[PDB]
């Protein structure tokens, strides 16, 4: 937004927004650009760290380049990139507040020996000083590591506040699961942390909580994380430390709040209103103190993740180096990334791999040496540490849970007010405002350990080859003992089986043969990788990943991993089973000063102790939950990551196999040039289909393993808690009974009632909530991912604005819509429907998915009402190019669904009787895994066919809705990337159908004051007619063929003039036009008759059956309306409850 | 639909067709979803 855009690396020094300033007290100088008040960008490498460092000091996962950001071209690209990111952050209210706060967050000034500011940059000549809170540099030595440093440690810890330097890397990002890290949130993290430095609230380096149990190591060792980073970094982890009530504290919090008030006070009494100071400072201060210290502690990435709809890693996100090997991708501004973030979002952005990936330093935490019986090395695998500092030592054992207790954080930031504070111009500099910057040096220790039993990291490593030629094998021992060594380890049974079945076959020559091959390759991969089996466990039914044991070598010694896991339980999957440490408590003593109190006071004082206690219980439980997360979940998340890596390794093998075959045919074969072209385009789509299938599998292992971890809490941790708690309340119960007996000033009847009031039982501490356990893993990110990856490729919406008709796509995909300007909208079934006139009107939807291919599945559905005239075959909707793809046609009285591949194979299927000028729900389902086509009309399944004979349907990326020659209505058009089942169709159809509206015979909304004819469900072609008997007139139907009774004309009336459409439960008056207007009444015989006087008219309740879409029911005083027995012969309309259910269904036809 | 929008620092109640362009449940955080709280004996603070 209004971040300063006017800068380039060649911008001249103006001494206002572009300066050349000294770095701390060094001899070194650098150029800085002011992008916002008090906020500068210095587009070079951080000055404080040497660019070339000794090999011994290079950290794992680091990339070291001394010539990076050396050139002017690079520097500008940097400067623009940061400016771009700050613009994105400022373009959303949340991040706009963050920047505004940071801007006004200037550190507290020192006093006379008038006031001296510590936040400024010095000109080289040291006669000019520029206000700065924040300065953003490029990386230090390691060019993938962001950093946030303080100008002066003392001022960062003492409540004054200190300037903050940031080291940032806009040009590289990595993939985590299905998404790219968004540098915008990575920068927001650095910015949030600076808040701690600007306020002078930086905690001791020693204030540190347990993060991850290092379950990789033979010994007991924890990784720790400073409170600052935990609170800022977001994700799930913090939910365990930050709790209500708090089980974890430190003087830091209470003291920070204390000093903050001291400084606020110094401001209030002295600085504010002091004319010796000036607004650019005191006004900013006033805003800095509108905040509460708690607001900063409560502020973190999870909040911006949500406000910006940015995906971020949500679990152990400061330990990722251990769980993951990062692969870096280049980001170019603004081609890849702009003020709206990644072009095409974090999932589908097209980013190039960095050539730097090969320069990444690899320094394992430990190395797993796998030998054989002869003590010779088969394999050496790497395990990487998280980077965090460790122990020392065990926190849970020595931590006492305190018995005595002593959303939005940016709400109080005012953007308008802050933006009107003149910039700080005259600065009176405080001389020593900074520390000599001292670079951190780190030597990385590596452990070698030997095993005759393959670890998961071994089985993983065996799933990679650099061999251009390789063979899949299911024997791990054979793979690593290979005399080839061409073998690579694979669990894909269906794929390996298929590859073997075709081993002896004549080579692939036709394109048709390539497709048949590629398709079977795809189906089998899907079957292998998405395999799950539901099992009964201690805690329930879990959907188990079938190949898990064969992948990681876990419970793999059986012939089946699944049954062995059902047997041994969730805890059998991890290496360290007993990590718990019973927490140290605060022992229970009731004061000796209450011994003589009177009842009322004794009473209400034990009530206080009762609450403190039950709160204390809750704290203990929390402590157990944190240990679970740290000690146990950490190990299941390791399993999740390794399992996910296994899936990628396998996927890679598959793609390489496919790529080789395609590459080979293109290399030497007689396949037509144009043919190869299609093959290339098509295979690409298949490779996407393979990732989508891989993704389903990576979700499978996430649910499976998360459930397991939760089962371990119920089955293993929780019961240890319950043990500890009944020892605890057994004690408390004792001491409280002994206390009450020793009470002097109360009687014996009082003692018994009191002991009873104050006694604890197990229910007081049974806190397990399984739904809460499960909800832990639903983060903003998990949700965002769901919405980005759901099956909708097109969801058509339409509505009427004043003077405008709106049509759009809600799928959240890339769909582009182009349509005739004059297309009209009309209310359909549940919403506005598009009207196509058949002549000039058309609409078209564009999505790369729409082209289909060989291997993808999809569903098309929509509501359609056709004013049916001609029988002649006419395009309605379809996607076709080069005579491939699919089309739905109007033909005869029906539709035709057509499907045709590049080899000429066709589906041409007539769907009878769809143009009655009544709404119909069309569902078409194409399933390549089951090779099955399904076509539904309304609630019926009209076609079920094999499509094994249809191969490559690649079409354009455009679906065209033409509706040639047949004016029609189309509503709720949807495209899905998955097949549809019959349950889903029924659910879609009926759910949409009950919106409270009653419908006419055509399923259009029933209207008041509109003329209809009335028909009973049982005789559907016979309209109600009027007949007089004794000088008065009744309602019947015509069973004497052409007795020339005239169809009677009906109109529904409402007590409310403003009411237009008829709804479920409405009160109604039925009228008829004969000579005058006649209104319906009930006789004493319960036979309906037309009368003279609206006053006497009976008010009836109209309603409908949820499963009968075009029909309605009518009742009076609970008595429903139906057709009588034969009489005259005539069948009278009667109010009676004893007839067959079918006779109570009516419909109005206009 | 009735919802709210930031104007300066004020969150003003708004009818905006931007909602009607959206699919049903999107996130858990809508802005066009409301609750109607009647005075109830079961809650009973001082109005």
From Swiss-Prot, chain A:
Keywords: Disulfide bond, Virulence. Pfam families: NTNH_C (PF08470), Peptidase_M27 (PF01742), Toxin_BN_H (PF22133), Toxin_R_bind_N (PF07953). Residues 786-1149 are annotated as: C-heavy chain nHC. It comes from the Bacteria. Residues 1-373 are annotated as: Light chain nLC. GO terms for molecular function: metalloendopeptidase activity; zinc ion binding. Has 3 domains that are structurally very similar to those in BoNT/A; light chain (nLC, equivalent to the light chain, residues 1-408), N-heavy chain (nHN, residues 409-829) and C-heavy chain (nHC, residues 830-1193). Residues 374-785 are annotated as: N-heavy chain nHN. Forms a highly interlocked heterodimer with botulinum neurotoxin type A at pH 6.0 but not at pH 7.5, called the minimally functional progenitor toxin complex (M-PTC) (BoNT/A, botA). Belongs to the botulism non-toxic nonhemagglutinin family. One of its GO terms (biological process) is proteolysis. This is Non-toxic nonhemagglutinin type A. Assembles with botulinum neurotoxin type A (BoNT/A) and protects it against pH-mediated inactivation or protease activity at pH 2.6 (the pH of the animal gastrointestinal tract) but not at pH 6.0. Necessary for neurotoxicity. GO terms for cellular component: extracellular region. Disulfide bonds join 539-711. The 133-Lys-|-Lys-134 bond is cleaved during long-term storage; the cleavage site is masked in the M-PTC complex.
């Amino acid at each position: 937004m209004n971040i300063n855009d006017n800068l380039s690396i060649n911008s001249p020094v103006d001494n206002k927004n572009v300066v050349v300033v000294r770095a701390r007290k060094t001899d070194t100088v650098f150029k800085a650009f002011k992008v916002a008040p008090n906020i500068w960008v210095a587009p070079e490498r951080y000055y404080g760290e040497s660019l070339s460092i000794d090999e011994e000091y290079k950290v794992d996962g680091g990339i070291y380049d001394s010539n990076f950001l050396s050139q002017d071209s690079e520097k500008d690209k940097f400067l623009q990139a940061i400016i771009t990111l700050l613009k994105r952050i400022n373009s959303t209210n949340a991040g706009e507040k963050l920047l505004s706060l940071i801007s006004t967050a200037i550190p507290f000034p020192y006093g006379y020996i008038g006031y001296r500011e510590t936040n400024y940059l010095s000109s080289e000549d040291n006669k000019s000083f520029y206000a700065s809170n924040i300065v953003i540099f490029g990386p230090g030595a390691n060019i993938v590591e962001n950093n946030t440093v303080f100008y002066k440690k003392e001022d960062a810890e003492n409540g004054m506040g200190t300037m903050t330097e940031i080291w940032f890397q806009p040009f590289l990002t990595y993939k985590y699961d299905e998404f790219y890290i968004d540098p915008a949130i990575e920068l927001i993290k650095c910015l949030i942390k600076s808040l701690y430095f600007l306020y002078g609230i930086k905690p001791s380096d020693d204030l540190v909580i347990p993060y991850r149990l290092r379950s990789e190591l033979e010994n007991i060792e924890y990784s720790q994380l400073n409170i600052v980073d935990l609170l800022v970094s977001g994700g799930i982890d913090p939910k365990f430390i930050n709790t209500d009530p708090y089980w974890f504290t430190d003087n830091y919090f209470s003291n920070a709040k204390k000093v903050f008030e001291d400084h606020r006070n110094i401001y209030e009494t002295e600085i504010e209103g002091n004319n010796a100071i000036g607004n650019d400072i005191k006004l900013r201060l006033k805003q800095k103190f509108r905040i509460n210290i708690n607001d900063i502690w409560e502020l973190n990435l999870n909040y911006f993740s949500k406000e910006f709809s940015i995906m971020m890693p949500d679990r152990f996100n400061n330990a990722l180096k251990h769980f993951y090997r990062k692969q870096y991708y280049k980001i170019d501004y603004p081609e890849n990334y702009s003020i709206n973030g990644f072009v095409n979002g974090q999932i589908n952005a097209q980013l190039s791999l960095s050539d730097r990936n090969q320069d990444i330093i690899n320094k394992p935490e430990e190395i797993i040496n796998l030998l054989n019986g002869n003590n010779v090395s088969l394999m050496r695998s790497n395990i990487y540490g998280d980077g965090l500092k460790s122990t020392v030592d065990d926190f849970y054992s020595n931590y006492k849970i305190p018995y005595n207790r002593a959303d939005s954080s940016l709400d109080n930031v005012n953007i308008g007010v802050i933006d009107n504070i003149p910039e700080i111009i005259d600065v009176n500099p405080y001389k020593e405002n900074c520390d000599k910057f001292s670079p951190v040096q780190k030597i990385t220790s590596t452990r070698e350990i030997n095993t005759n039993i393959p670890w998961p990291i071994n089985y993983l490593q065996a799933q990679n080859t650099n061999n251009e030629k390789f063979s899949l094998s299911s024997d791990f021992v054979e793979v690593v003992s290979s005399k080839d060594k061409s073998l690579v380890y694979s669990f894909l049974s269906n794929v390996m089986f298929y590859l073997d079945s075709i081993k002896d076959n004549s080579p692939i020559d036709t394109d048709k043969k390539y497709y048949l091959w590629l398709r079977e390759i795809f189906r089998n991969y899907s079957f292998d990788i998405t395999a799950t089996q539901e099992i009964n466990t201690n805690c329930g039914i879990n959907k188990v990943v079938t190949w898990f044991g064969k992948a990681l070598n876990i419970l793999n010694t059986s012939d089946s991993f699944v049954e062995e896991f059902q047997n041994l339980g969730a805890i059998s999957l991890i290496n360290k089973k007993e990590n718990l440490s019973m927490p140290i408590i605060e022992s229970y003593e009731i004061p000796n000063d209450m011994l003589g109190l009177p009842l009322n006071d004794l009473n209400e004082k034990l009530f206080n102790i009762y609450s403190k206690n039950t709160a204390y219980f809750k704290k203990i439980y929390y402590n157990f939950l944190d240990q679970w997360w740290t000690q146990y979940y950490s190990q299941y998340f390791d399993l999740i990551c390794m399992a996910k890596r296994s899936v990628l390794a396998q996927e890679t093998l598959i793609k390489r196999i496919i790529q080789k075959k395609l590459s080979y045919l293109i290399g030497n074969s007689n396949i037509s040039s144009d043919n190869l072209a299609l093959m290339n385009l098509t295979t690409t789509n298949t490779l996407r289909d393979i990732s989508n299938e891989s993704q389903i599998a990576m979700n499978n292992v996430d649910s499976f393993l998360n459930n397991a971890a939760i089962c371990v809490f119920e089955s293993n941790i929780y019961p240890k808690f319950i043990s500890f708690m009944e020892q605890c309340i057994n004690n408390i119960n004792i001491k409280t009974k002994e206390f009450i007996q020793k009470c002097t000033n109360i009687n014996e009847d009082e003692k018994l009632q009191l002991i009873n009031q104050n006694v604890f039982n197990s229910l007081d501490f049974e806190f397990l909530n399984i739904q809460n356990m499960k909800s832990l893993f639903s983060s903003e990110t998990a949700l965002l991912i769901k919405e980005e990856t759901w099956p909708y490729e097109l969801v058509l919406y339409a509505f009427k604005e004043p003077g405008n008709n709106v049509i759009g796509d809600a799928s959240g995909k890339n769909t582009s819509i182009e349509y005739s300007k004059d297309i009209g909208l009309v209310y359909g079934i549940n919403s506005d429907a598009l009207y196509l006139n058949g002549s000039n009107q058309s609409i078209s939807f564009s999505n790369d998915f729409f082209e289909n291919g060989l291997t993808n599945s999809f569903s098309i559905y929509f509501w359609l009402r056709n004013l049916g005239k001609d029988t002649i075959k006419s395009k309605l909707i379809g996607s076709k190019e080069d005579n491939c793809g699919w089309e739905i046609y109007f033909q005869d009285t029906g539709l035709v669904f057509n499907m045709i591949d590049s080899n000429g194979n066709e589906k041409n299927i007539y769907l009878s009787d769809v143009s009655n000028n009544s709404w119909h729900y069309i569902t078409i389902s194409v399933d390549r895994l089951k090779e099955q086509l399904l076509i539904f009309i309304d609630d019926n399944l009209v076609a079920n066919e094999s499509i094994k004979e249809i191969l490559n349907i690649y079409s354009s990326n455009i679906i065209s809705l033409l509706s040639e020659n047949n004016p029609s209505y189309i509503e709720g058009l949807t495209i899905l990337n998955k097949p549809t089942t019959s349950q889903e169709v029924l659910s879609n159809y009926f759910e949409v159908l009950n919106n409270s509206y009653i419908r006419d015979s055509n399923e259009e909304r029933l209207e008041y004051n509109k003329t209809y004819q009335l028909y009973n469900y049982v005789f559907s072609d016979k309209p109600i007619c009027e007949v007089k008997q004794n000088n008065n007139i009744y309602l019947t139907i015509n069973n004497t063929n052409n007795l020339n009774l005239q169809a009677s004309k009906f109109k529904l009336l409402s007590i409310n003039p403003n009411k237009q459409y008829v709804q479920k439960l409405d009160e109604v008056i039925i009228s008829v036009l004969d000579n005058m207007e006649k209104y319906i009444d009930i006789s004493e015989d319960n036979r309906l008759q037309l009368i003279d006087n609206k006053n006497n008219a009976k008010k009836m309740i109209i309603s409908n059956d949820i499963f009968i879409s075009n029909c309605l029911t009518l009742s009076y005083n609970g008595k429903y309306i139906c057709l009588s027995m034969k009489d005259e012969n005539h069948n009278w309309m009667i109010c009676n409850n004893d007839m067959s259910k079918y006779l109570y269904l009516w419909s109005f036809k206009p | 639909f009735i919802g709210f929008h930031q104007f300066n620092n004020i969150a003003k109640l708004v009818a905006s067709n931007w909602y009607n362009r959206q699919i049903e449940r999107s996130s858990r955080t809508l802005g066009c979803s409301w609750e109607f709280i009647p005075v109830d004996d079961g809650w009973g603070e001082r109005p």
